[PDB]
Amino acid sequence: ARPCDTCRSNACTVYCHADSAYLCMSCDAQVHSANRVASRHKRVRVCESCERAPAAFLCEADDASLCTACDSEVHSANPLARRHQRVPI
Ligand SMILES: [Zn+2]
Ligand SMILES: [Zn+2]
Ligand SMILES: [Zn+2]
Ligand SMILES: [Zn+2]
């Protein structure tokens, strides 16, 4: 999986595109609270499946946010899984 890029000790939970880095939540809240410009970064969640990527879709049934690839892969497996209605972040 992926370690947090500010502190390499935790695992990343979020992705900031502007900073182009994947963070854990304490780093996330630290880094973008520092100033009013970091404050206006917009940050999306890392995939809860692969953990190495940013999430394109949310699923309520899977209660998860996943990459395009992993979103497609989770709901590829079953007609059952395919029927899940996913929505973008
Ligand atoms: Zn961290
Ligand atoms: Zn940022
Ligand atoms: Zn994924
Ligand atoms: Zn689903």
From Swiss-Prot:
Tissue specificity remark: Expressed in leaves, shoots and shoot apical meristem. Detected in the vascular tissue of the hypocotyl, the cotyledons and the leaves. Restricted to the protoxylem and phloem in young inflorescence stems and to the phloem only in older inflorescences. Also detected in the vascular tissue of the root.
GO MF annotation, one: DNA binding
Subcellular location: Nucleus
Outcome reported for the amino acid change (mutating R43H): In co-2; late-flowering under long day condition
Zn finger (B box-type) start-end: 1-41, 42-89
Source organism superkingdom: Eukaryota
Amino acids binding Zn(2+) 1: C4, C7, C27, H32
Residues annotated as binding Zn(2+) 2: C47, C50, C70, H75
Chief place of localization: nucleus
Biological process according to GO: cell differentiation; far-red light signaling pathway; flower development; regulation of flower development; response to far red light
GO cellular component terms given for this protein: nucleus
Induction: Expressed with a circadian rhythm showing a broad peak between 12 hours and dawn. Higher expression under long days.
UniProt entry keywords in alphabetical sequence: Developmental protein, Differentiation, DNA-binding, Flowering, Metal-binding, Nucleus, Repeat, Transcription, Transcription regulation, Zinc, Zinc-finger
UniProt keyword Transcription regulation, yes or no: yes
Subunit and partners: Interacts with ADO3, SPA1, SPA2, SPA3 and SPA4. Interacts with MRG1 and MRG2 (via MRG domain). Interacts (via B-box) with MIP1A. Interacts with AS1 to form a functional complex regulating FT expression. Interacts with NFYC9. Component of a red light-dependent nuclear complex made of PHL, PHYB and CO. Interacts directly with PHL in the presence of PHYB.
Similarity remark: Belongs to the CONSTANS family.
The record's note on its domains: The CCT domain is essential for the interaction with SPA1.
Note: The GIGANTEA-CONSTANS-FLOWER LOCUS T (GI-CO-FT) pathway to control photoperiodic flowering under LD is conserved between Arabidopsis and rice, but the regulation of the downstream gene by the upstream regulatory gene is reversed in the two species. In Arabidopsis, GI acts as an activator of CO, which in turn activates the floral activator FT under LD conditions. In rice, GI activates HD1/CO in a similar manner to that in Arabidopsis. However, under LD conditions, HD1 suppresses HD3A/FT expression, causing the suppression of flowering.
Main function: Transcription factor that acts in the long day flowering pathway and may mediate between the circadian clock and the control of flowering. Plays a role in the regulation of flowering time by acting on 'SUPPRESSOR OF OVEREXPRESSION OF CO1', 'TERMINAL FLOWER 1' and 'FLOWERING LOCUS T'. Also regulates P5CS2 and ACS10 (involved in proline and ethylene biosynthesis, respectively). Regulates the expression of NAKR1 by binding to the 5'-TGTG(N2-3)ATG-3' motif.
Name this protein carries in UniProt: Zinc finger protein CONSTANS
Species the sequence originates in: Arabidopsis thaliana
Classification of source organism: Eukaryota, Viridiplantae, Streptophyta, Embryophyta, Tracheophyta
Positions spanned in the full protein: 17 to 105 of 373
